[PDB]
Every structure is written in C-alpha cells, then in structure tokens.
C-alpha cells in the first residue's frame, strides 16, 4: 500500500522497491505525470443528454 492507503499494483510496488534499493527515484516529469494521473482518477471516480435535448 502507498502512504495514501491505496492498494498497490505489483509493478509499481517493485518500482518503489527498486527506487529504495538503488537510492534514486524517478524524474520530476514522471512524478508530475503520475500525480496528475492520480488526481485524474480521483476526479473521474468522485462523480450531455440534457444539452443534446435542448440543442435538438
């Protein structure tokens, strides 16, 4: 599990293990991409027919 408490897929679990093992993490761009993906998932999960009906 990650610090936020989400179940961790084995691939990124090993990613974190290897980071901690070697002693160097991912780049800034990759961190930003990962975080933006997490908040994208949060925004999608936390939730045009009327528009189409009105425009028809």
């Amino acid at each position: 599990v990650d610090e936020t408490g989400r179940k961790l897929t084995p691939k990124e679990a090993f990613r974190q293990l290897s980071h901690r093992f070697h002693g160097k993490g991912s780049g800034k761009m990759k961190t930003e991409r990962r975080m933006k993906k997490l908040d994208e998932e949060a925004l999608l999960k936390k939730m045009l027919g009327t528009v189409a009906l009105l425009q028809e």
């Binding site: 599990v1 990650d2 408490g5 679990a13 293990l17 901690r20 093992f21 070697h22 002693g23 160097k24």
Partner: peptide, 21 residues
C-alpha cells in the same frame, strides 16, 4: 491497516558494508 514497506539500501551508500537498522 497497512504500512509502506521499509526496504534497505545496497548501492551508493557511503556506509559500512553491513546493513543499517
């Protein structure tokens, strides 16, 4: 509950050959 795994380091340590705690 669950906690993040606490792994040790091998490469680029500047420390003793043996592991820390």
């Amino acid at each position: 509950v669950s906690q993040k795994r606490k792994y040790r380091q091998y490469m680029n340590r500047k420390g003793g050959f043996n592991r820390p705690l």
